Amino acid sequence: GTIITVTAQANEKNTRTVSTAKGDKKIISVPLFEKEKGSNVKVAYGSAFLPDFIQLGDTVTVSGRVQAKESGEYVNYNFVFPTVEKVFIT
Amino acid sequence: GTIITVTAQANEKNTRTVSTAKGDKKIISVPLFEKESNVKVAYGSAFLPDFIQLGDTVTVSGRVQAKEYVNYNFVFPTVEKVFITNDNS
Amino acid sequence: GTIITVTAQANEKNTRTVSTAKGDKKIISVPLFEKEKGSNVKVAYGSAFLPDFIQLGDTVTVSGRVQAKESGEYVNYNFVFPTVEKVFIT
Amino acid sequence: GTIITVTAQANEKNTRTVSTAKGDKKIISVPLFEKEKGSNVKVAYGSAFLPDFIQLGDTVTVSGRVQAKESGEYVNYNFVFPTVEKVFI
C-alpha cells in the first residue's frame, strides 16, 4: 500500500469551507508529489479535512492513504481518514 | 514537501533490469495512490539494492519528483526488505 | 510533528485477540525503531487495532502518530487512530 | 521495516554544530513520538545531519530509518541516510 505525508501552510488559496452534517469544516488541497519549480508538468492535488483548531497561516502535516475517484469526467483525489497534525512555528 | 512510502513485492511484472554505470541493476515500479473505476494510476520508479531478489517484498520511501513527457522518480530513497514467512496454520 | 510507518507480518508473537463489550478486537504490536544485532537496548513497541478481516500471515502497514503513556512502571506506546492497510503478497 | 517522518523548525535548542572529517556540520534533534499531558515519560530524540544550506529558523522535514545504538550506558537514536528537505513558509 501507499502512504503519503505532506507538509503545507494553510492559506486562502489552498483552503475551503464546507457545511457538513454537523458544523463547518475546513478542507485543504495539498500536492501529491514534487516538481521542478518553473516546470511545465502537472501535479495532482489531494483533499483532506482539517481539525477545527487549525487556522489560516498554520503549517500542517497531512498523512494517509489517497484514493482517486470519478465525479463526472473529473478525477477526485482524497485522503482517507488521514492523520492531520499542527507544526509548531515561532 | 511530500514524502511517499510504498510497500510492494518485487515481481517480474513490476521490475526490470537496466545497464548502469557499474553493472546490471534492478528498477521497481510502485503505485503512488489507489483507485476505487476508470482512473489512471501514476507509478514511481526506484533502484533496488543488489541483494533484493524477485519475490522479496520491499518498502520504498522518500521524495517523488515528476521530471520533464513526465516520469515519476524517487530521489535517493530508503529501500528496505520486509521479512515474510508462511503462516503456521 | 511525527509520523511513524511500520510494515510487519501478523503472527503468534505480535498479535492477540481481546474480548470486549463490542466483540473481538485484534491488537498488533510493532517495533518503533531498529537496533544492532547483539544490542542491549529495549526497543519500544507500539500497539494498534487491526481491522476484522486480517488474519495471521497477513502483512500490514501501520501508520500515524504514537503517544507514550504512563501505567504503573510500564510505559505504553499507542498509535492514535492510525491508517492500517493490507499488503498483497503472491 | 520502520520509517519515521518528522517535521520541525531548526532552533538554537534542537540544533548543534559538530566537527566531522568533511568539515563542520549541523545536527538536528527531533522527538520520535508524543507524550500524554501529565505523564512522567521520556521521549526518544532522533539525530540527523542537516545540509549546509539550511539555517536556524527554517522548518525542515527529516524522514527515514531510525537506528538505536548504545555506547556505555548512553543511547543514541540515529537516522540512517535520511531524506532531509526544507519547508517553504
CATH number for the domain that contains residue C55 = 2.40.50.400
Read off the amino acid at residue C54: I
Distance CA B73, CA B67 (A): 8
Give the chain B residue whose CA is nearest to the CA of A74.
Answer: B39
Among A25, A23, D32, CA closest to A10: A25
Residue owning grid cell 503472491 = C90
Inter-chain residue contact D3 with C4, CB threshold 8 Å: yes
Inter-chain residue contact B70 with A1, CB threshold 8 Å: no
Give the chain A residue whose CA is nearest to the CA of B64.
Answer: A33
User: Is the C-alpha dihedral spanning B29, B31, B37, B40 positive or negative?
Assistant: negative
| Number of domains making up chain B | 1
In this structure, are residues A62 and C62 in contact, taking their beta carbons and an 8 Å threshold? no
* DSSP track, C19-88: EETTEEEEEEEEESSEE-TT------EEEEEEPTT--TT-EEEEEE-EEEEEETTEEEEEESS-EEEEEP
The coordinates were experimentally obtained by: X-ray
Inter-chain residue contact A6 with B4, CB threshold 8 Å: no
Closest CB from B7, B33, B70 relative to A32: B33
Instruction: Give chain B's contact residues with C (Cβ, < 8 Å).
Output: 5, 7-9, 11, 57, 59, 61, 82-89
Read off the amino acid at residue C21: A
Q: Which partners does chain D have (≥3 C-beta pairs < 8 Å)?
A: A, B, C
Distance CA A12, CA A22 (A): 23
Distance CA D48, CA D54 (A): 13
Inter-chain residue contact B77 with D83, CB threshold 8 Å: yes
> Which structural domain range is residue C68 located in?
1-90
In this structure, are residues C87 and B57 in contact, taking their beta carbons and an 8 Å threshold? yes
**Burial, B64: exposed, middle or buried (Cβ in 10 Å; 0-12, 13-18, 19+)?**
buried
DSSP SS3 for B10: coil
Distance CA B18, CA A64 (A): 32
At residue B88, φ and ψ (nearest 5 deg) are -75, 5
Most C-contacting residue of A4, A50, A63 (CB-CB within 10 A), to test interface: A63
Inter-chain residue contact A61 with C1, CB threshold 8 Å: yes
Closest CB from D1, D65, D80 relative to B82: D1
Closest CB from A36, A65, A75 relative to B39: A75
In this structure, are residues B45 and B29 in contact, taking their beta carbons and an 8 Å threshold? yes
Contacts of B1 in chain A (CB under 8 A): 6-7, 34
User: Is the C-alpha dihedral spanning A42, A10, D83, B29 positive or negative?
Assistant: negative
Inter-chain residue contact A87 with D59, CB threshold 8 Å: yes
User: Is the C-alpha dihedral spanning B62, B47, B12, B52 positive or negative?
Assistant: negative
